[PDB]
């Protein structure tokens, strides 16, 4: 499905069946098919978590600057005092993430294994493809068409690099992302990476 | 405003004439060589299906005159 470098050919292991299959495997990582179907899931989950992360560390900032709601800037957001401790959050984020991630693990190991509740055994999940559970993960029931999966993976690949840009625009700049965007739009030819270094 | 209208017409209808002559040189293969045949706007008919970039250029020109 398309090609990322027209001078290069899509490898034989990327047949275009998968969503987002522009043939980008220059370093031959998904050459074994097991690695391919594992890295599909790793891409989907890193991209979905990156979308949530970017949306949770940028949208706070574009609302802080305009003054709609004041909220911290994602790096001074840890040191704030919350209704629990700094580690209690880690305890909960371990207890009820181990359960959901090991069930996703059992799904990406064998697909039809884990779809019904432990407690309410009637409320099963439909037999969707791996990495796309559906059911209560689809309450509005927007269809998982291949174009939608491609849109998912594209926004996710974009949000991953956006998070990387955030980490490196706080590691060697010191300021937030949206402040860096306003600094770029102030004078684009004088507020870039090749002025900081 | 007179000079600005001069500029935009002189860059618009010039494009329109070059699109018309591209229409004409496309029609020369159909009708042979005759101005009552290869310049007759009646039997031109439709050329969107055949010459697309001429269509886009002529359309941007005629919208440049249609305002």
């Amino acid at each position: 499905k398309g090609e990322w470098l027209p001078g290069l050919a899509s490898p034989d292991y990327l047949t275009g069946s998968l969503a987002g299959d522009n043939g980008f495997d220059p370093l031959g990582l998904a050459e074994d098919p097991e690695n391919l179907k594992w890295f599909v899931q790793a891409e989907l989950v890193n991209g979905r978590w990156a979308m949530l992360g970017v949306a949770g560390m940028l949208l706070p900032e574009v609302f802080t600057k305009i003054g709609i709601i004041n909220v911290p800037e994602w790096y001074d957001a840890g040191k704030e005092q919350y209704f629990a401790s700094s580690s209690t959050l880690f305890v909960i984020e371990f207890i009820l993430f181990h359960y959901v991630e090991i069930r996703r693990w059992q799904d990406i190991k064998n697909p039809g294994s884990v779809n019904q509740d432990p407690i309410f055994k009637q409320y099963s999940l439909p037999k969707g493809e791996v990495g796309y559970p559906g059911g209560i993960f689809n309450p509005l029931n927007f269809a998982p068409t291949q174009e939608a999966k491609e849109k998912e993976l594209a926004n996710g690949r974009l949000a991953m690099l956006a998070f990387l840009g955030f980490v490196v625009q706080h590691n060697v700049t010191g300021k937030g992302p949206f402040e860096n965007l306003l600094q770029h739009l102030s004078d684009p030819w004088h507020n870039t990476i090749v002025q900081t270094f | 405003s007179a000079l600005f209208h001069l500029i935009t017409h002189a860059y618009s209808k010039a494009l329109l004439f070059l699109g018309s002559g591209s229409i004409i040189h496309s029609m020369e293969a159909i009708v042979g060589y005759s101005p009552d045949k290869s310049q007759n706007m009646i039997l031109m008919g439709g050329l969107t299906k055949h010459v697309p970039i001429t269509k886009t250029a002529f359309l941007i020109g005629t919208l440049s005159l249609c305002g």
């Binding site: - | 935009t8 618009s12 494009l15 699109g19 029609m27 293969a29 055949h50 440049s64």
Partner: protein
């Protein structure tokens, strides 16, 4: 080739005055049906200069001024302006567009 293949003719040229359409239609009170007029509508043939090449695109030396003039008429069409240093807003505009 025709619609019947090997029927109705070995092909027909010199199609005659088929006013009756070979239906043996008889005439009521009228002026004339047949006369001394024997005129065959001899049509032209097939399978000769058959191609009739559809109008393809001209070469690069025709499109290239048209592309540059497209870039002009898109660029000039939006010209804090240079109206004074070089040398009713919605209603009049929507009236002209209307």
């Amino acid at each position: 080739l025709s619609l019947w293949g090997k029927e109705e003719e070995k092909k027909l040229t010199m199609n005659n005055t088929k006013r009756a359409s070979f239906f043996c239609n008889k005439t009521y009170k009228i002026s004339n049906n047949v006369r001394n007029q024997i005129f065959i509508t001899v049509e032209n043939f097939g399978l000769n200069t058959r191609t009739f090449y559809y109008p393809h695109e001209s070469d690069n030396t025709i499109l290239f001024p048209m592309l540059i003039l497209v870039l002009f008429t898109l660029f000039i069409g939006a010209i804090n302006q240079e109206g004074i240093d070089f040398d009713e807003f919605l209603r009049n505009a929507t009236f002209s567009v209307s």
